[PDB]
Motif scaffolding. Structure first.
Motif, PDB file in Angstrom:
ATOM      1  N   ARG A   1      10.035   6.828 -15.339  1.00 56.09           N
ATOM      2  CA  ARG A   1       9.940   6.710 -13.890  1.00 56.09           C
ATOM      3  C   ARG A   1      10.120   5.277 -13.411  1.00 56.09           C
ATOM      4  NH1 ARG A   1       5.301   6.839 -12.771  1.00 56.09           N
ATOM      5  NH2 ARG A   1       3.827   7.226 -14.478  1.00 56.09           N
ATOM      6  N   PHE A   2      10.042   4.302 -14.313  1.00 58.87           N
ATOM      7  CA  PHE A   2      10.268   2.901 -13.984  1.00 58.87           C
ATOM      8  C   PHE A   2      11.723   2.535 -14.250  1.00 58.87           C
ATOM      9  CE2 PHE A   2       5.699   3.055 -14.748  1.00 58.87           C
ATOM     10  CZ  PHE A   2       5.202   2.289 -13.710  1.00 58.87           C
TER      11      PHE A   2
ATOM     12  N   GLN B   1       4.286 -14.087  -8.185  1.00 53.81           N
ATOM     13  CA  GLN B   1       2.943 -14.076  -7.618  1.00 53.81           C
ATOM     14  C   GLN B   1       2.241 -12.745  -7.849  1.00 53.81           C
ATOM     15  OE1 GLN B   1       3.638 -15.164  -3.561  1.00 53.81           O
ATOM     16  NE2 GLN B   1       4.808 -13.310  -3.071  1.00 53.81           N
ATOM     17  N   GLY B   2       2.994 -11.668  -8.056  1.00 54.35           N
ATOM     18  CA  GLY B   2       2.397 -10.376  -8.323  1.00 54.35           C
ATOM     19  C   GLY B   2       2.367  -9.467  -7.114  1.00 54.35           C
ATOM     20  N   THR B   3       2.639  -8.180  -7.322  1.00 54.08           N
ATOM     21  CA  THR B   3       2.615  -7.183  -6.256  1.00 54.08           C
ATOM     22  C   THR B   3       1.621  -6.097  -6.637  1.00 54.08           C
ATOM     23  OG1 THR B   3       4.993  -7.624  -6.112  1.00 54.08           O
ATOM     24  CG2 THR B   3       4.087  -5.929  -4.654  1.00 54.08           C
ATOM     25  N   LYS B   4       0.566  -5.945  -5.838  1.00 55.17           N
ATOM     26  CA  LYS B   4      -0.501  -4.991  -6.122  1.00 55.17           C
ATOM     27  C   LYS B   4      -0.219  -3.698  -5.366  1.00 55.17           C
ATOM     28  CE  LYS B   4      -5.220  -4.369  -7.233  1.00 55.17           C
ATOM     29  NZ  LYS B   4      -4.914  -3.896  -8.613  1.00 55.17           N
ATOM     30  N   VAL B   5       0.168  -2.659  -6.099  1.00 54.43           N
ATOM     31  CA  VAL B   5       0.368  -1.332  -5.533  1.00 54.43           C
ATOM     32  C   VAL B   5      -0.966  -0.599  -5.548  1.00 54.43           C
ATOM     33  CG1 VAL B   5       1.518   0.879  -5.812  1.00 54.43           C
ATOM     34  CG2 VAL B   5       2.781  -1.243  -6.213  1.00 54.43           C
ATOM     35  N   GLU B   6      -1.460  -0.264  -4.356  1.00 57.65           N
ATOM     36  CA  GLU B   6      -2.747   0.387  -4.168  1.00 57.65           C
ATOM     37  C   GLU B   6      -2.570   1.512  -3.157  1.00 57.65           C
ATOM     38  OE1 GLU B   6      -5.528  -2.392  -2.534  1.00 57.65           O
ATOM     39  OE2 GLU B   6      -3.996  -3.510  -1.428  1.00 57.65           O
TER      40      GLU B   6
ATOM     41  N   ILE C   1       9.543   2.326  -9.009  1.00 57.56           N
ATOM     42  CA  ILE C   1       8.622   3.258  -9.660  1.00 57.56           C
ATOM     43  C   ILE C   1       8.855   4.711  -9.252  1.00 57.56           C
ATOM     44  CG2 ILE C   1       6.161   3.610 -10.284  1.00 57.56           C
ATOM     45  CD1 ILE C   1       5.723   0.751  -8.982  1.00 57.56           C
ATOM     46  N   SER C   2       9.680   4.965  -8.233  1.00 52.97           N
ATOM     47  CA  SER C   2      10.037   6.326  -7.794  1.00 52.97           C
ATOM     48  C   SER C   2       8.733   7.078  -7.527  1.00 52.97           C
ATOM     49  CB  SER C   2      10.967   6.961  -8.820  1.00 52.97           C
ATOM     50  OG  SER C   2      10.231   7.547  -9.877  1.00 52.97           O
ATOM     51  N   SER C   3       8.619   8.349  -7.911  1.00 50.22           N
ATOM     52  CA  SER C   3       7.451   9.173  -7.623  1.00 50.22           C
ATOM     53  C   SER C   3       6.177   8.502  -8.100  1.00 50.22           C
ATOM     54  CB  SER C   3       7.577  10.549  -8.288  1.00 50.22           C
ATOM     55  OG  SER C   3       7.586  10.443  -9.703  1.00 50.22           O
ATOM     56  N   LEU C   4       5.381   7.946  -7.183  1.00 48.60           N
ATOM     57  CA  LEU C   4       4.157   7.295  -7.622  1.00 48.60           C
ATOM     58  C   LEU C   4       3.311   8.338  -8.337  1.00 48.60           C
ATOM     59  CD1 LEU C   4       3.107   4.584  -7.766  1.00 48.60           C
ATOM     60  CD2 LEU C   4       2.278   4.705  -5.428  1.00 48.60           C
ATOM     61  N   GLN C   5       2.494   7.888  -9.267  1.00 47.05           N
ATOM     62  CA  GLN C   5       1.786   8.746 -10.204  1.00 47.05           C
ATOM     63  C   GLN C   5       0.436   8.132 -10.518  1.00 47.05           C
ATOM     64  N   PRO C   6      -0.464   8.860 -11.192  1.00 41.89           N
ATOM     65  CA  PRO C   6      -1.818   8.339 -11.340  1.00 41.89           C
ATOM     66  C   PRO C   6      -1.856   7.143 -12.276  1.00 41.89           C
ATOM     67  CG  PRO C   6      -1.606  10.130 -12.861  1.00 41.89           C
ATOM     68  CD  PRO C   6      -0.223   9.917 -12.210  1.00 41.89           C
ATOM     69  N   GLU C   7      -2.795   6.239 -12.001  1.00 37.63           N
ATOM     70  CA  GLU C   7      -2.997   5.007 -12.758  1.00 37.63           C
ATOM     71  C   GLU C   7      -1.858   4.014 -12.563  1.00 37.63           C
ATOM     72  N   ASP C   8      -0.887   4.324 -11.706  1.00 34.43           N
ATOM     73  CA  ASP C   8       0.223   3.418 -11.472  1.00 34.43           C
ATOM     74  C   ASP C   8      -0.078   2.443 -10.344  1.00 34.43           C
ATOM     75  OD1 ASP C   8       1.582   4.692 -13.463  1.00 34.43           O
ATOM     76  OD2 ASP C   8       3.149   5.542 -12.186  1.00 34.43           O
ATOM     77  N   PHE C   9      -1.309   2.461  -9.842  1.00 33.36           N
ATOM     78  CA  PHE C   9      -1.783   1.528  -8.828  1.00 33.36           C
ATOM     79  C   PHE C   9      -2.395   0.335  -9.553  1.00 33.36           C
ATOM     80  CE2 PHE C   9      -1.359   4.504  -5.274  1.00 33.36           C
ATOM     81  CZ  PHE C   9      -1.272   5.701  -5.959  1.00 33.36           C
TER      82      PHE C   9
ATOM     83  N   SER D   1       0.847  -1.188   0.000  1.00 26.63           N
ATOM     84  CA  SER D   1       0.000   0.000   0.000  1.00 26.63           C
ATOM     85  C   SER D   1       0.885   1.241   0.000  1.00 26.63           C
ATOM     86  CB  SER D   1      -0.936   0.013   1.211  1.00 26.63           C
ATOM     87  OG  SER D   1      -0.231  -0.271   2.407  1.00 26.63           O
ATOM     88  N   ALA D   2       0.562   2.210  -0.854  1.00 21.64           N
ATOM     89  CA  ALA D   2       1.364   3.425  -0.930  1.00 21.64           C
ATOM     90  C   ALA D   2       0.521   4.560  -1.492  1.00 21.64           C
ATOM     91  CB  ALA D   2       2.621   3.218  -1.780  1.00 21.64           C
ATOM     92  N   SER D   3       0.996   5.781  -1.271  1.00 25.58           N
ATOM     93  CA  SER D   3       0.300   6.988  -1.689  1.00 25.58           C
ATOM     94  C   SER D   3       0.975   7.615  -2.906  1.00 25.58           C
ATOM     95  CB  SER D   3       0.243   7.998  -0.540  1.00 25.58           C
ATOM     96  OG  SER D   3       1.366   8.863  -0.573  1.00 25.58           O
ATOM     97  N   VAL D   4       0.250   8.544  -3.536  1.00 24.57           N
ATOM     98  CA  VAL D   4       0.764   9.218  -4.721  1.00 24.57           C
ATOM     99  C   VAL D   4       2.001  10.028  -4.362  1.00 24.57           C
ATOM    100  CG1 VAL D   4      -1.458   9.259  -5.894  1.00 24.57           C
ATOM    101  CG2 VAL D   4      -0.856  11.107  -4.335  1.00 24.57           C
ATOM    102  N   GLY D   5       2.998   9.988  -5.244  1.00 17.69           N
ATOM    103  CA  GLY D   5       4.241  10.702  -5.060  1.00 17.69           C
ATOM    104  C   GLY D   5       5.288   9.976  -4.243  1.00 17.69           C
ATOM    105  N   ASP D   6       4.904   8.936  -3.508  1.00 15.93           N
ATOM    106  CA  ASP D   6       5.865   8.176  -2.727  1.00 15.93           C
ATOM    107  C   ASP D   6       6.717   7.327  -3.670  1.00 15.93           C
ATOM    108  OD1 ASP D   6       7.193   6.598  -0.733  1.00 15.93           O
ATOM    109  OD2 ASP D   6       5.537   5.157  -0.781  1.00 15.93           O
ATOM    110  N   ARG D   7       7.858   6.853  -3.172  1.00 11.88           N
ATOM    111  CA  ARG D   7       8.743   5.995  -3.949  1.00 11.88           C
ATOM    112  C   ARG D   7       8.570   4.551  -3.502  1.00 11.88           C
ATOM    113  NH1 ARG D   7      14.810   7.593  -4.611  1.00 11.88           N
ATOM    114  NH2 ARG D   7      14.520   5.798  -6.005  1.00 11.88           N
ATOM    115  N   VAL D   8       8.470   3.650  -4.476  1.00 12.84           N
ATOM    116  CA  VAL D   8       8.176   2.242  -4.243  1.00 12.84           C
ATOM    117  C   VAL D   8       9.174   1.359  -4.985  1.00 12.84           C
ATOM    118  CG1 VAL D   8       6.475   2.359  -6.069  1.00 12.84           C
ATOM    119  CG2 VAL D   8       6.437   0.466  -4.524  1.00 12.84           C
TER     120      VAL D   8
END
Lengths: 221, 223, 224, 220
Positions: free
Chosen positions: A176-177, A215-220, A190-198, A127-134
């Motif tokens: 950004r990837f 298995q897959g990692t769901k960024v939400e 993904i660095s600066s999270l951005q829209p639709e990147d969830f 789970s992460a917010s917009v603009g955060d780095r993942v």
């Protein structure tokens, strides 16, 4: 433009059969291998089958071997998957894909309902917010050098190849990837999270057969 | 297994001529292109010539064009470089190399002394570091070359060794402590854990267009 | 669409001058095939001049042309170029661009270059032949050394570009009528025009495809 | 020296199982596809299976599909054919062959006992030394120049003579000529030397399954 238009799914009783078709356009179909990859309801991507450029030699997965048959018509630029002896475990959304292991172009997918080995591990949930780095990690059971691919998939849509090889970025993908790693450890940043990147991100080995996904990692949010 | 044995060097007067031979073994010689790459005393590597799998089509550098002639005998598995009109600028160690742009195997080299366009920028030129430290070398191209870059390592007096091909793919036998990244006009070679055998001069070379140009070279040393 | 090779850039020059020949290609992936330049002197046979690879790094020239001509290509514009410098009176000829490096399946229109001041040897046996319509004709081609099955048979009408008839000694090219048959191997080859018909009165050439330079035959003129 | 040494055959009861191995040497095994071709006692050659440069992509025949499995170990330079549910029709001498459609090098063969249609004319022809021989091979569909001519002497493995309908193989004497295209092809043996008395086969190399001709046995 490269287009992969699918059809032929539906609902069948256990033991029945189905035929999936995939019409290709925009590229020389006879010069590339083709693949079928399925996604179970709620589960990750699973490579099902592959056929060579000439359609002679074919390869399948252990769960589908002996029951599924991949074919192609180079005169019609079409790919076919005959699924026989269908079980409830074969209920999934199926995609046709270009090339043998790094699938740059996918099809829309088609739902198939049945009702009456190198392993790669990711973080699985984040789970992460917009603009955060993942940063997502992918590990292989054996050394695979730079034989990894990173895909992105939104719910209900087809996967999209964003990173090929360990680090090379695909055209149209924002810079950004970032991809890093080698051998047994790899990272997608993904660095600066951005829209639709969830969405759900997958890593897939391209060294040996069967081509296995993570298995897959769901960024939400 | 793979051997590229050179001969034919020596001393020549300005304006004279020489013939360099390179006998190949351990691989199907007729199935690969071949190249001649030179290194001036104390300077960096410079691609000199290249020949196709059959020996028909040849390519040269502007400084050697009209003066050098590359040829090959596939029946004898030999590569030849006829150097005419030798100048004082031609004093260098010459190597025969496998393939046309990514040179995976090199030869011992032979010294030629004469007495009597994508520009690559490698930075820094010289860097001092200790064992275990992390090192990052940058390579820049004047134009976009996609992922057509190679990273070689050369120890003093020995022939270069291919470490990274296609900007980021690692060569067999190279430890995973070497990392390659970059695209377009900027690329980086990262030597995470500096080992004592990693003190040497590293070069970057573009593989997009002809002539294949190398970087200025970055010498990582101990102090 | 079809394959098109449109030439330009010829003309008249004084001895020692220079000229540039251009050849725009279309209908095929230009960057995936080598290209060549072949010239024909007034009244003489075909002579391979130069060749460039699919990408454009390594090039090959003829000994009579080496050091004076430069072959190049622009894959972004699908164009082939021949810069002819230090032109001598022996270079007066009609020049053609051709697809591929040894068996040329597609040729260019040709362009005339006039310069005026104001080794596997192939042997073609019949030089000139008279025959009537419907007759059977056999032309022989001999090589100085063994070339296996690396031979091509071309047909050229006066003032026109050559046309590939037979490749790989016996395989017939698409569009060629089946009245043309190719046989032979090693040192002896034969082109047989079973039933003459009118359209086949022209000059036929044989060309080796084994080693460089690609050499042509002297030419056999089937006429009445 | 290119060597393809086979083993693992023998006698089995119907329904039994067998495993065939083929060790390769003299060439880069990981750089070429491999094939398994069988010949029934007294009958002609029949392509059974093929495997890609790696063990991933495989191809089989309809009579062999579902029962045989071709695999390979590039680390051991070995090719494998696992034959399950063997029937009396599977009794044959099996050969491993290099490449997937033009087989330039064959193996010794191993006997297994369980206890596009090509037409080749004639089936058997008698001729004397120095005579001229012409064998015809016809396909049900156009195969362009995707034809091969093989020679087999009694008790030995086949030998590739002609590839691509007309191109001659290295080491083969120039007395063998190949011609044809599309649906008609001819193999012409000029000056019938005594070492040319054998059975000659024609094989298409265009589409799967690779089918052979009935075979022409030149005798006396």
């Amino acid at each position: 433009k490269v287009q992969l238009l699918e059809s032929g799914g539906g609902l069948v009783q256990p033991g029945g059969s189905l035929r999936l078709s995939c019409a290709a356009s925009g590229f020389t179909f006879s010069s590339y291998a083709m693949s079928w990859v399925r996604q179970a309801p709620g589960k990750g991507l699973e490579w099902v089958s592959t056929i060579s450029s000439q359609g002679q030699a074919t390869k399948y997965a252990d769960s589908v071997k002996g029951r599924f048959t991949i074919s192609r018509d180079n005169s019609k630029n079409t790919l076919y998957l005959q699924m026989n002896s269908l079980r409830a475990e074969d209920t999934a959304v199926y995609y046709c894909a270009k090339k043998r292991y790094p699938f740059d172009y996918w099809g829309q997918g088609t739902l198939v309902t049945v009702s009456s080995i190198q392993m790669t591990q990711s973080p699985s949930s984040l789970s992460a917010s917009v603009g955060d780095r993942v940063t997502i990690t992918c590990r292989a059971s054996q050394s695979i050098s730079s034989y990894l691919n990173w895909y992105q998939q939104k719910p209900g849509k087809a996967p999209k190849l964003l990173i090929y090889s360990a680090s090379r970025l695909q055209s149209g993908v924002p810079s950004r990837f970032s991809g890093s790693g080698s051998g047994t450890d790899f990272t997608l940043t993904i660095s600066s999270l951005q829209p639709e990147d969830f969405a759900t991100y997958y890593c897939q080995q391209r060294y040996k057969t069967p081509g296995t996904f993570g298995q897959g990692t769901k960024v939400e949010i």
